[PDB]
Write a protein that binds this ligand. Structure first.
Ligand SMILES: [Zn+2]
Length: 168
């Protein structure tokens, strides 16, 4: 599991992508013009992640065209409620759609585990790609976000919701 890394500038600030031949491990937010990854080339999961992020931010109408890379962070290597939540989220909630913590918990097999779902949103090593920003409050409120409220709102505004893109 030879770990390789590359960084990509984005509207949300610098993104550190890490992964190996087997899959992408993590997308880390370190804090208008499309940028390239600082280090080009494989492993394949990294190149796929870079193309997906570029499309997400700069060619969103075509986001469904880009393959989601294989994931190899340990959380995906074992069976757990967190993994089920993360995989369910990735599969069901599309660009522009939202789901409540409770609906995701129901989707993951336990309608009463909304709090566990919230915690799982932070155990998410690959934000944006696995759209944890689309998990919101049943009240209509945006809700918490590991990377800060402003980022969640920026992403939701980017996906068509009636929120203004905050200053980031
Ligand atoms: Zn790996």
């Amino acid at each position: 599991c030879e770990m390789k890394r590359t960084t990509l500038d984005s509207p949300l600030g610098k993104l550190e992508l890490s992964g190996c031949e087997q899959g992408l491990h993590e997308i880390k937010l370190l804090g208008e013009v499309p940028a390239p990854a600082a280090v080009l080339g494989g492993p394949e999961p990294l190149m796929q992640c870079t193309a997906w992020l570029n499309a997400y931010f700069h060619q969103p109408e075509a986001i469904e065209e880009f393959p989601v890379p294989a994931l190899h962070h340990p959380v995906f290597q074992q069976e757990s409620f967190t993994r089920q939540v993360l995989w369910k989220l990735l599969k069901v909630v599309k660009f522009g759609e939202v789901i409540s913590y409770q609906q995701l918990a129901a989707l993951a097999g336990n309608p009463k585990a909304a709090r566990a779902v919230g915690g799982a949103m932070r155990g998410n090593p690959v934000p944006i790609l696995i759209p944890c920003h689309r998990v919101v409050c049943s009240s209509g409120a945006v809700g918490n976000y590991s990377g800060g409220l402003a980022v969640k709102e920026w992403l939701l505004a980017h996906e068509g919701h009636r929120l203004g893109k905050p200053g980031l």
